[PDB]
Amino acid sequence: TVHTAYLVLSSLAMFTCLCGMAGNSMVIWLLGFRMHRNPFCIYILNLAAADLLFLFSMASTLSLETQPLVNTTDKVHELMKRLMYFAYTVGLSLLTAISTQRCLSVLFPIWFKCHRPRHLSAWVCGLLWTLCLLMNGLTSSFCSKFLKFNEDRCFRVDMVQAALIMGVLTPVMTLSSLTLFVWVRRSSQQWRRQPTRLFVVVLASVLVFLICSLPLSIYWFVLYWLSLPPEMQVLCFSLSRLSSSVSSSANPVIYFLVGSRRSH
Numbered sequence: 681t682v683h684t685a686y687l688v689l690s691s692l693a694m695f696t697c698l699c700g701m702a703g704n705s706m707v708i709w710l711l712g713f714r715m716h717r718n719p720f721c722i723y724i725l726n727l728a729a730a731d732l733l734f735l736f737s738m739a740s741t742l743s744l745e746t747q748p749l750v751n752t753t754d755k756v757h758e759l760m761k762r763l764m765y766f767a768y769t770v771g772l773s774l775l776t777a778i779s780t781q782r783c784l785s786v787l788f789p790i791w792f793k794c795h796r797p798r799h800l801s802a803w804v805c806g807l808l809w810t811l812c813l814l815m816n817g818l819t820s821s822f823c824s825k826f827l828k829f830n831e832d833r834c835f836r837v838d839m840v841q842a843a844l845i846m847g848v849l850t851p852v853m854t855l856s857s858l859t860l861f862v863w864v865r866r867s868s869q870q871w872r873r874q875p876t877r878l879f880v881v882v883l884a885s886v887l888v889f890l891i892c893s894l895p896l897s898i899y900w901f902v903l904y905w906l907s908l909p910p911e912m913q914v915l916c917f918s919l920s921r922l923s924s925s926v927s928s929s930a931n932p933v934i935y936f937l938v939g940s941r942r943s944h
């Protein structure tokens with residue numbers, strides 16, 4: 681019954697996590713000190729690193745939660761689960777930043793070329809990492825069974841994190857991507873040959889972000905606390921992990937391969 685769906689989806693999650701390790705390692709290798717004169721390369725490398733950490737963290741979590749969590753595979757297990765959620769949050773924030781950068785590259789092209797700071801991406805990434813680390817430190821300091829545990833404070837932290845994500849990251853990313861789509865459609869499709877590639881890649885990015893990345897967020901930060909019966913909460917959690925791992929493994933294909941002008 682449910683114990684078969686759980687194990688099969690966990691096996692799928694492990695497989696896509698390992699594929700994500702391979703892909704993100706290749707992307708990291710291909711972006712070292714070079715192929716970064718393009719303003720669209722710092723974000724991709726940072727996203728690859730964050731996705732690699734996130735997929736490694738689920739790989740470890742799935743390996744550890746198989747064997748009994750008696751006394752020694754529990755503290756490290758929760759540590760790397762917190763690491764996984766931190767990396768997931770920073771990856772979602774990086775996706776939002778990438779979409780906003782792509783939108784601004786066409787909404788304000790003169791500013792993007794002759795006025796954007798050469799290191800704007802660098803400190804935006806640094807600020808995103810710092811904010812994600814601070815928020816996840818708050819989350820772990822109020823929700824961990826080891827560090828410091830509470831019910832009301834943990835619920836409040838989860839609620840504020842869910843509000844932040846679902847009211848900043850999803851609206852900003854969706855509006856930026858749809859503004860890019862509409863601007864290209866209503867400004868370039870009429871004059872030149874229709875940019876079919878741009879439309880299809882933008883739609884694929886939005887679709888994969890909406891139906892693959894959010895499930896884990898909407899489960900962990902919302903569906904966890906709402907009173908839901910068991911034997912179905914496991915299914916939601918496992919579907920969320922599989923969708924998020926698929927999204928993180930497909931990010932290198934949809935962001936680096938589509939946009940590999942330099943490596944061509």
Ligand SMILES: CCCCCCCCCCCCCCCC(=O)O
Pocket residue numbers: 773776777778780781782784800801804848852
């Ligand atoms: C207020 C809470 C935190 C909100 C963080 C939002 C992160 C995504 C939006 C800004 C990122 C992209 C900024 C411009 C990037 C560029 O054009 O190089």
Ligand SMILES: CCCCCCCCCCCCCCCC(=O)O
Pocket residue numbers: 784788789790791
């Ligand atoms: C962190 C992201 C910051 C984004 C700031 C956007 C700057 C826009 C500046 C005004 C538009 C300049 C180019 C068009 C000029 C015009 O309107 O005629």
Ligand SMILES: CCCCCCCCCCCCCCCC(=O)O
Pocket residue numbers: 722726799802805806809810813
């Ligand atoms: C876990 C906390 C980490 C905090 C700092 C993380 C910084 C990640 C890397 C940001 C900059 C990447 C390289 C930029 C190079 C450049 O364009 O000069």
Ligand SMILES: CCCCCCCCCCCCCCCC(=O)O
Pocket residue numbers: 810813814817818821
């Ligand atoms: C560099 C970014 C910040 C990283 C650290 C974030 C804060 C750590 C977690 C909070 C620990 C203490 C929380 C309050 C404890 C209490 O009120 O009993």
